[PDB]
Amino acid sequence: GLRYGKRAFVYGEPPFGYQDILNKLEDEGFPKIDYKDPFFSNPVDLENKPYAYAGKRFEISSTHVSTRIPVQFGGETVSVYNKPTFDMFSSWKYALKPPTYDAVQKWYNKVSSVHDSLTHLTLEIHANTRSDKIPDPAIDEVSMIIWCLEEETFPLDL
Amino acid sequence: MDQKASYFINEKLFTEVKPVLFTDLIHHLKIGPSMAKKLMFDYYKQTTNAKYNCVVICCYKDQTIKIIHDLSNIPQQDSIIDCFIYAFNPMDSFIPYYDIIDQKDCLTIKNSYELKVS
Amino acid sequence: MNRWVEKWLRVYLKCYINLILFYRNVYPPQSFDYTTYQSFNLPQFVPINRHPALIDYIEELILDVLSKLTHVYRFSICIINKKNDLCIEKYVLDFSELQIITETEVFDEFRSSLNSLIMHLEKLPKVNDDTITFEAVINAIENWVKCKIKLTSLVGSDVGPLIIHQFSEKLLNGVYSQYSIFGS
Amino acid sequence: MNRWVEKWLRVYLKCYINLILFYRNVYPPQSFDYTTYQSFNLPQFVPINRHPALIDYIEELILDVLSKLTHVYRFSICIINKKNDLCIEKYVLDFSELQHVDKIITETEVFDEFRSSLNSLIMHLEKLPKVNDDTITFEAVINAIELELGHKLDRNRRVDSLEEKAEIERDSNWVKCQEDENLPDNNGFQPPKIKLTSLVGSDVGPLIIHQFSEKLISGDDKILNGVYSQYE
Amino acid sequence: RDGIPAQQKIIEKCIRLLFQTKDLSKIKKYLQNEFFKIQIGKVSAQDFCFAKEVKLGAYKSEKTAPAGAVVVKRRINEDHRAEPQYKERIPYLVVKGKQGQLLRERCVSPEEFLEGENLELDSEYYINKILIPPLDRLFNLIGINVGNWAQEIDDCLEKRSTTTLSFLIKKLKRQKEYQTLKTVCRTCSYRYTSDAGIENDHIASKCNSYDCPVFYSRVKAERYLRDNQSVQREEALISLNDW
C-alpha cells in the first residue's frame, strides 16, 4: 500500500457505496438506468425548431460537442466571457487518438407393416394453345398428362 | 565520359535521391550501351564511400535476363555470357520511375519505317 | 489573477474527481451523465454523477480544499481496496503555486491537464465491481482526521504562478480484470 | 492558385505520414499496400494502409492541418513509446518560407521534387533500427505563430452547415502543449542527447518545404526498453 | 400484406436502426438515400408490386371495386380464360399519369409494366403515400416527421481521354453485368434443358418468371443496353474517336 505522506489528512467517507448509489438514486426519484433518448449524431439535422406532436413537447438534442452544455459548478454554468487573448509561437497537439496496433491487426486477420396413411396421386397436364390465349377446355385439347404417386405411403409393393 | 559521367552519377545519386541507370548515361552523353556499361564499372571502382547498392544482371546463353539478388550463389556460372551493373541504388528498395525520353540520336537499332508528320 | 484561477480550478477539480470516479469502479456506470456535458471545450465525453447528494459532497470537498489552499501542499484521490485497506492507486496534484496572468492561459493549462488525465485514464486496465473505494487525502505544509510504485508524470499548469504538478502512482487479489467503458 | 497547391500538399502529407507509419512499425506491415492511386495520383509506389478507420483519421488530420496552414510554420509527427509517454523519434516538416499565393509550375516538376524528397525520407528511414510489434504509437504536433484553439465553443453557436460543423470540430480538436514536453527531463546521470538529421526538401516554385528528423539515440535506462528489437 | 416489399424493408430497417443506435442521423441518411434511389429509378421494381386478393363477384358496384379488380377485369376482357380464383392475390403497379387521375386508373400489371416502352413507376406517389404515413406514425411519437426529410431531397469534349474512359467504363460495367445475368439464367435453365451450348441460351432467354428478381434485372439490363442514351453515348464515342 502506498504511503499517504509525512503529514496527511483524511476526508470523511462518501455517503454512498457501490451498491447503494443506484438504489438511493431510485429512491430520490430518478430512474436507476437513464437510457439514451433518440438523438442526432450531428447538429446539422437539429433544425432549431420545437419537436412536438398532439400537444406533447419532445426534447431532442445531439451528442456533438457543439450542443453539449458546459459543466456547471454549484448549479451555475462557468464559461469564458472575454475574448481570447493569444501569444506568439504557440504549439498544439492533435488530441484525437489513432487506432491501436491491436485493432488494425485484428481487422487484417478477419479479412410398421400396418397401413395407417392415405395414398396420394398428383396430376398435371399440358395443352397446346393457339397464339397467346391460355389453355381452353372447349377449343384446346390435352397433349400430355404427368402423374406421380407418393411412394412413401403406398403399400402393396406392386 | 571521364570526369563527366562520374559527376552526373554523383549528382543524380546524392544531390537528388534517384536511382541511376546506364540507359541514363546513354541518353545523357549520347554513347553506346557497351560504353555506358564500361563507365558504370569504372564508377563502381575507386569509391571508398559505398553509399549505394549496385544492381547487376546476368545474361545467360538461353537469354535468361536475371536480376542478381543473393549476391553469394549465382546458379549456372558457366552459362553466364554477360554481366554488368544495371543501376546504382541509394536505397534498399529499387522501384525506379520512367518518363518520356527524347531519343533523338541515342538509338543503336533504328526501325526501318520513318515517322511521317502531316 | 487569483479570481480566474479559483473560478476555473473549481470546475477542473470537479471534472478531475468525476473522471477518476467514473473511469475506475468506485461507482458503477449508468450512475453518471456522460452525454450532456463538456469539461473544457474538449472533444471527449466527460461524465458527471446523476446523484445530487454525491455531487454536493464533491463540491463541498472542493470548496473546503480551495479554502485552505495556502496551507495545503498536496491533494490526492486515493484508491483503496476493500477487505485490504491498501492504497492500490493514487492520483496526486502537487501544489507549488504562489499567491498578471490572463484567464485564457489558465483555461488552456487546465484544458491540457484534463486532456492528459483523460488520455491516461482511458489506457488503464478495467477494475471489477464493488471492489474499489476512494478517499480524498490532503497534505499540510509544515471533516478532516489526521492519518513498489509506478510513477506516471502528467502535464499540469506552468503558465506563471500556477505550477501545479500532476502525476499518478500504482501498486491486490483479483481486483483487476482485463476486458470500452462507454460501450454500455 | 491554391486549388492545385492544396491538392499537392495533401498528396505529399499523405505519402509522408504513410511512409513514417510503414517504416517505423507503428502498424503491421501486412495492412500496408504498395500503390500509386489513393484517391489521388501519388508520386511513386508509396505504401498506403488499407484500414478504413486509419485512412479516415489520416485524411481528417491532413485536412485539419491544411485548413490552418497559413498560421502553421512547422508540422511534426512524434513517435511516442507506449510503455512510458516519451517521444523517442520526431520527424519534422518545415513549412516556413512556403509561398502563400492565391493567384505555372505544372504537376510533373512538383511530383519530381516530391519524389526526391520522399526518396530521401525512405533512405533515412531504412537505416533506422527495427521496431517491435504493438509497442509504439504516433502523435501529431504543429507549431503555430498567431492562433488560439479550443475557444470557439464559448459563443454557444449552433451549426447549420457541414462546413461550420467541420470548422467548430477543427477549432477544438487541439490541446495546447509545450516545446519538448515529451522529452526526458535531463536527469543528469548520463543525460540523453537529441540527435538531429537533415533531409532533402522540395523546392518547387510555389512549394518550399524543408524536412529534418530527430531521435533520442541515447538514454539513462528505462528508455527505449523493449522497443528496438534488441541489437537487430 | 396490403403494401409493397420495399416499404416493409424500409420500415424494418428504420425501426432496427432506432432500436439499436437510437441515432436519428443514420435513419435520416438511410431514408434520404432510399428516396433518392426511388426517384432516380435504381429500384428492383419487384419490391413495388401490390398484391391484394380480390373477390370478383362480391363487390357492390364497378365503382367500389378494388384496384386489382380493374386489372383482373382488363385481362378477362382480353381473354376470358384469365379469370382468377376466389380470394387470389392479383399483382399490380402504379405508373405516372395525368394530374388528378384516379389511382385505379393507372393500375399497371407487371406484365404490362415490363412490356410497356414508356411506363415509369410513380415515384412521387410511392414515396409520399406508401412511405411517409407509416414512418410518420412510427416517428411522430418521437417528435420528428419524415416528411421534411423527404421534401429536403464543351470542357469535357476538349479532354477526349477522360470522356472516352468514362463512357468505356460505363459500357463495360453494363456489359459485364448483362453477361453475369445471362450466365446465371443459363445455369438455372440447365435444370430443364440439361444442355450447355446453344439452344439452351435460347430457352433460358424464353423465361418470363415474375417471381424471380433476376428476371427483372435482366429486363432492366436489356432496356439499358437498348436505350437511346446508350446510342447517344456510342455516337459521341464515334465522334470523339473520329480524329
Place this chain on the structure above:
Amino acid sequence: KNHFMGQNSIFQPIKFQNLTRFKKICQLVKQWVAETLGDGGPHEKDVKLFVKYLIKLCDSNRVHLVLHLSNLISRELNLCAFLNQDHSGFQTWERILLNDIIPLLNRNKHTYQTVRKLDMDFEV
C-alpha cells in the same frame, strides 16, 4: 496572405548573394566549393561571407539548414578525394570546413521560445 507574415511567405528567408531558394544556394555553394579547389583555395572574403550567412541562419533557428550545408560540403570533399586530394586546395577547404563550421553548430540553441531541452548531437 495575412498580417503576421514577414514576407510573401510566413517567414522571411535569409538572402545570400541575391539568392532566396535553398536549393539554388546549395547548388551555388557546391559549384563554388568544386571550383575553388583548383584555384588553390577559396578567397578570404568569400569564406567570411559564408560564415556570416551561416551565423545568420543559426541565429534564425535554421540549424537544420546549416547541418545540410555542412553535410553537402563534407560529401563534396569526400567525393573529390583520390583525384584532387592533397592538392593544396583540398586541405585548406577541409581545415576551413572543420574550424570555421563545426564549432558553429553548437551555438544559438533557441527555438523562438527560451532554449531547447537536452543537448545537440548533430549527424555531421
Place this chain on the structure above:
Amino acid sequence: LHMDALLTKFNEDRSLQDENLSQPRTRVRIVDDNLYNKSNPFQLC
C-alpha cells in the same frame, strides 16, 4: 564465385565496338500485307 570477380571478368574486357551510334543499323523490315488490304472478317460496325 564473388560477384566482383564476374564484374571484373566481363565488364573489364568490354568490346566497345560497333556502337558508334552515328549510323545505327536499320531493323529488319517486316510488312503486314493485310494492313491496307482491309476486308477484316472480325471488324464490326
Place this chain on the structure above:
Amino acid sequence: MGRINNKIDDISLIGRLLICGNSVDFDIKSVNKDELMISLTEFSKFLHNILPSISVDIMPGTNDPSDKSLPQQPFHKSLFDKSLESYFNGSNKEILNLVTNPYEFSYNGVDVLAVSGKNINDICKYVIPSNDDIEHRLDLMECTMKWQNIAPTAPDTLWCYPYDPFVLDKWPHVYIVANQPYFGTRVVEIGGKNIKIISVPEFSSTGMIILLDLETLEAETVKIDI
C-alpha cells in the same frame, strides 16, 4: 532495343513486336477513370520510348478496356498520351497498329492467326466428364483447328453477331493463343497442311517472351527475372 543483350547482330533480326492483349489489369465493378488513366499513361510512356526502335502491334484483351464479346474492336485512338499524336496521324500505321482481338497477320507472306485466348479460356471453364495441363491446352487448340471454328462455345465467347467470321475459310500457317497458364508449341498436320500452334504465356506471371522465326517457323523463348 539492344541495350541489354548488346549483340546488335541478332537483336536487329526482331522486326516487329506483337502485344497480344491484357495490357492493363483492373476490375470493372470498382474502378475510376483516374487509376485507369495512370496505367494507360504508363503504357503510353512505354510505347513512346519503344516505338522509335521497333514496330508494335496492339491487341485487345479480356480485362482491357474493350467489349466483353470475343470480336473485340481495336483500341480507341484516345486513351493514349498526347506524345503519340504523330503516330496516330493516320499515315504512319506501319510503326503503331491497333487491330481487333482475333486478327490474321500476313507477316512477310506468313499468315498468323492470333487471339488473346478467350476461346480457350472459355472452353476450360467447363467441367466435361468425358475427356489443367499444357498438353491439354495444346490438344484443345488442335481441336479448335480441326473443327474449323475459333469459338466452339458461342454462348460464352461471342455476343449477338449481326448478319460468322469465327468459322474458318482458310488455314493459317501459325496459330497464336495468348494469356495462357503455360508456354507450349506443337506442329500439327490436318489434311496434309502444316499448322504451328503457339501458346503465349502471360508476362505478369512467368515473365517470358516468345521469339518467332518467320523463315523456319521455329519459336525460341526469352525469360526475364525481376
Place this chain on the structure above:
DNA sequence: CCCTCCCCTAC
C-alpha cells in the same frame, strides 16, 4: 369534415 366500402390484422 364526414361517410361508405374494402383489405387485413390482432384477440
